[PDB]
Every structure is written in structure tokens, then in C-alpha cells.
């Protein structure tokens, strides 16, 4: 026993405001990541090595954006296989950046806390472990994107979306997203930094401040989106009952904060241009 709330769309907000932001983000991210990859790959430290991986992870997202922008403007003309490919690439590039940030935090912990015998595990870890710990789990976490991401036709409109049997997998995968992207890497990063600051209280800062700024910017671009996801999931569980206009308000704010969070693929070349590398 529950009445339905249907989503609302208007030509002015979606079809004009979102394509422009997507285009600006696309041009900025593609130029920045192309320049960074060209300079790094074809002329270092270890943070630069991890930032090259971050740039490569950002390129996939930037590539993915010309599809969402076109879908927002006109339609989805690209078929069914490309729908799955876009979803899989988006999920991989989403999950493979926070893990690299956690690896950067671990590298800083090893470099600063020990500083006596760490070049060997730092090498081993960087070369051998990043491939088996960042990309492989990210690829494995995209099975639901392989299965449930399909294109469906209604009248003359094709939509690319994740179609689940009922509204509980949405909650399950939103909680999985929050847990994977925000908590465990967050715990690792904040514990490495707590132990570093505890170690350096009685006491290098040119790279530590840069890494701290990068991590803070990345985790501050995604926080409103995670708050919106949490509120939406607490509405789907029927723990928050505040009418039907509240749901539309939170959906609009989730859209806006997602557009804001799509700016994470430009931070790396901005901290490269401004801070001077």
C-alpha cells in the first residue's frame, strides 16, 4: 500500500544546463590528461608514477562523457553493446581511483614512518601489487554492470539504464558503492595520516602537502553525492516518509551533486599546472 512518485523533467535544466557542463568537463579533462600523459610517459618519483595511473583512470571517464551528453540532448542511438561498455568503463574508472589514492597514502606512510629499510617493499608494492590490487578488483566489481545494464525502447525513445528486478538491488549496490568508495580506503588513508602526524609531532612537506591537498580535494568533490545517495537509500527503505515533493527535491540535488562530482577528472592536471610539479 503505497502511492507512486514519477520523476519530473524539464527542457531548461536537463537539456541545456547538463550538456554544457559535460562538454566543459570533457574538454578540460581530455586536454589536461593528454598533456599529463604525454609529459610523464615521454619526457621520476613514486607519487608521479601513481599520478600517471590516476590520469589514465581519468581518461576513461572523460571518454565516457560524450555518450552521456548526447543521451541527455537527443537520444541513445548507439545500440546495446555500447550501453554495457559505457557502464563498465564508468564503474572501472570510478572504483580504480580511490584505490590508487589509498596506495599513495600507503607509499607515503612507508617513506616517512620507516625511512630506513623501505625502498625494497616500496618497489615490490608499486610495481607488482598495484596491478593485482587496484585494477583486478575494479574489473571484478563490474559484473552487475555487465548483467543489468541494458537499453530499452519506449515509443521512439531508447534509454540506457540499469534495470533490476525490484528496488532493493538499487539499495544494495548503492551501499556497496558507498562502502567501497568512501569507508575502507577512507579508513586506510586517515589511519596512515594519523600515524604520520603522530610520528612527526616531535620533529618532506613539499610532497606531503601536495598529496594531502589532492586527497582532500578528491574526497570533498564526492561528499555531497554520497550524502544524496545515503538519503535516497534511506527513502527507498521507507525509513524517511516526508511526502512526494521531498523525493523530487532530493533527486534534483543528487543530479546536481553528481554533475559537481564529475569534476574529479580535472584535479590532477590542475595540481600539476598550479603547484608546478
Amino acid at each position: 500500500m503505497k502511492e507512486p512518485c514519477f520523476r519530473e523533467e524539464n527542457a531548461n535544466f536537463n537539456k541545456i544546463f547538463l550538456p554544457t557542463i559535460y562538454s566543459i568537463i570533457f574538454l578540460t579533462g581530455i586536454v589536461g590528461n593528454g598533456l599529463v600523459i604525454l609529459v610523464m610517459g615521454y619526457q621520476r618519483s613514486m607519487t608521479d608514477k601513481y599520478r600517471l595511473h590516476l590520469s589514465v583512470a581519468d581518461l576513461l571517464f572523460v571518454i565516457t562523457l560524450p555518450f552521456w551528453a548526447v543521451d541527455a540532448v537527443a537520444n541513445w542511438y548507439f545500440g546495446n553493446f555500447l550501453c554495457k561498455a559505457v557502464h563498465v568503463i564508468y564503474t572501472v574508472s570510478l572504483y580504480s581511483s580511490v584505490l590508487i589514492l589509498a596506495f599513495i597514502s600507503l607509499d607515503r606512510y612507508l617513506a616517512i614512518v620507516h625511512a630506513t629499510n623501505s625502498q625494497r617493499p616500496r618497489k615490490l608494492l608499486a610495481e607488482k601489487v598495484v596491478y593485482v590490487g587496484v585494477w583486478i578488483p575494479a574489473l571484478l566489481l563490474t559484473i552487475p554492470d555487465f548483467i543489468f545494464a541494458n537499453v530499452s525502447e519506449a515509443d521512439d525513445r531508447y534509454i540506457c539504464d540499469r534495470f533490476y528486478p525490484n528496488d532493493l538491488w538499487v539499495v544494495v549496490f548503492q551501499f556497496q558503492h558507498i562502502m567501497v568508495g568512501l569507508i575502507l580506503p577512507g579508513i586506510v588513508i586517515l589511519s596512515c595520516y594519523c600515524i604520520i602526524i603522530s610520528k612527526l609531532s616531535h620533529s618532506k612537506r613539499k610532497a606531503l602537502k601536495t598529496t594531502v591537498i589532492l586527497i582532500l580535494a578528491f574526497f570533498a568533490c564526492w561528499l555531497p553525492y554520497y550524502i544524496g545517495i545515503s538519503i535516497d537509500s534511506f527513502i527507498l527503505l521507507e525509513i524517511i516518509k516526508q511526502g512526494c515533493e521531498f523525493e523530487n527535491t532530493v533527486h534534483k540535488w543528487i543530479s546536481i551533486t553528481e554533475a559537481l562530482a564529475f569534476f574529479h577528472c580535472c584535479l590532477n592536471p590542475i595540481l600539476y599546472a598550479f603547484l608546478g610539479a
Epitope: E3, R7, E8, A154, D155, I159, D161, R162, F163, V170
Partner: antibody, heavy 125, light 111 residues
Amino acid sequence: QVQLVQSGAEVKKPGASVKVSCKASGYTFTSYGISWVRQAPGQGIEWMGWISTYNGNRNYAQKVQGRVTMTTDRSTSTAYMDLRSLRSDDTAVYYCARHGITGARNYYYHYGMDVWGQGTTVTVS
Amino acid sequence: DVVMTQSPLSLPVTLGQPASISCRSSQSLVYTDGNTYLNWFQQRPGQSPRRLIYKVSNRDSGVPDRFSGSGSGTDFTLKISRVEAEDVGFYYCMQNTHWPLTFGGGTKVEI
């Protein structure tokens, strides 16, 4: 092929109950919603209700509210409609249509009515 | 909520000559995204309704080129450029912009 198959014609006494089914095939059952409509002999087509096969959200018309209930079955991909406290005015032909679309980020109601059932004649005497 | 008025009640037409059925709504059938969702249904005797045209003037798959639709705002029209022996039946116009959907009165095309 996309199709919906209903049950047979049936005759009921006044005050009885009618449970009519609608089985969908040829498409993903949970990506759309099911709308139940009726047409009386010598009268226009009148909307009766809508049920979402995705999350079980339903809405009945004000005229028929209080006597109609709708349920779904994902395992057998079918939708039911139960009408109770029948009167002689309920003698009509009931149709089942695919109405609306309900996905993770899309939950609209202005798409559909593409495919319909063959309709069942309910005679109340 | 939204009433739809159809004209004429009965439309006797001759073979090879055009036919026009016009229906008008109580309110403006323009959605918040700028699209109008009014569609036309044809019902033969003993069969479920079959669409012809959707979104004011967009034809389905399998309908002939004779059928066409026009009008915008609160007045919409269906036209058959050449009436054939298989066009006999009932014609309805339905709007799907406001919850809930409503049907037209229905017009009987008599050969």
C-alpha cells in the same frame, strides 16, 4: 514476440469476486508497468488502475477505489486484478495494457499503451 | 480530470474520399519538457484497440500512409486521405500527459 495473454470470459453472481490474470511474454516484465482498463457495452473506454511490476507501487481510480486490488508475480511474469462486491454495472470487457516505464533512474508514466491483451468479458447477473 | 470531446459522433464517408475526426481537450496538453502526448486508437469489432499515430503525428509500424494527424495545443485532428473498406470501426483519441490518462468519446466510421 511482445504479447499479453489474459484469461477467459466469465459469468459471476452479484456480490461475488472476479480475479483476472494477464501474463506477459516477449519482454522484460519488470521494466514496465501494467494498466487495467475496462470498456462497457455501448459506452466509452474508462481507466481503472495502474500497478508497477518493479517496486509494487499501485494507483486505483477514484470511482473503483475500495473494491479493486492488484498484485504481480515475477516468477511467472503475470499480473492479477481482483474486483469484489460486484454489481450489474460491472458487466464489461476488461483489457490489460503495458503502460509506463520503471528503471533505476527512470520512472515515467507517459510511455506505453503499445501492446494490449485480448480482453475478458465479465458478465454480472 | 481532463475531458476530451470528439466530433463528429458518426462519420459516414465514401470510398476514395478523405475523412477527418477532430477532438479537443479541456486543458493544454503540453508537458513540462515541451512534448505533446496525444495518440489515436482504432478498434475493429471484436478486437482490442490498435494504435495508429502517437505523439500527435508520429505513425507506428505497420500502419498505412493514408493516416495522418495534426493540431497542437488544445485541438487535434486525424485525417484519412483515402477511405478504404478496411477502415470501418471506432476511433478514439487518448492523452497521456496528466495523471490519470483519459480516452475520447469515440467516433464510428461508416463505409
